A paper describes a structure:
Seven of the nine structures present an antiparallel (AP) backbone of class 7 or 8 topology, while 2 peptides, those of APRGLP2 and polymorph D of APRTc5b, form class 1 or class 4 steric zippers both comprising of parallel (PA) β-sheets. The glucagon-like APRs (APRGLP2 and APRGLP1) show an extensive contact surface (Sc = ~0.80; Area = ~160 Å2) along the extended, linear backbone of high complementarity, while exendin-like sequences (APRex-4 and APRTc5b) present generally smaller values (Sc = ~0.65; Area = ~110 Å2). Aromatic side chains form intrasheet aromatic ladders in the two parallel structures of APRGLP2 and APRTc5b (polymorph D), as well as in both polymorphic structures of APRex-4. Additionally, within a zipper, amide groups of Gln and Asn side chains can stabilize parallel β-sheets by axial H-bond ladders. The amyloid crystal structures of APRGLP1, APRGLP2, and APRex-4 revealed the nature of emerging interactions between charge-abolished side chains contributing to steric zipper stabilization.
Here, we identify an evolutionarily conserved hexapeptide sequence as the major aggregation-prone region (APR) of gastrointestinal peptides of the glucagon family: xFxxWL. We determine nine polymorphic crystal structures of the APR segments of glucagon-like peptides 1 and 2, and exendin and its derivatives. We propose that the pH-dependent changes of the protonation states of glutamate/aspartate residues of APRs initiate switching between the amyloid and the folded, monomeric forms of the hormones. Our results highlight the dual role of short aggregation core motifs in reversible amyloid formation and receptor binding.
Author numbering: 1 to 6
C-alpha cells in the first residue's frame, strides 16, 4: 500500500 501526494 502507498500514498502518492503531489
Amino acid at each position: 500500500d502507498f500514498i502518492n501526494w503531489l
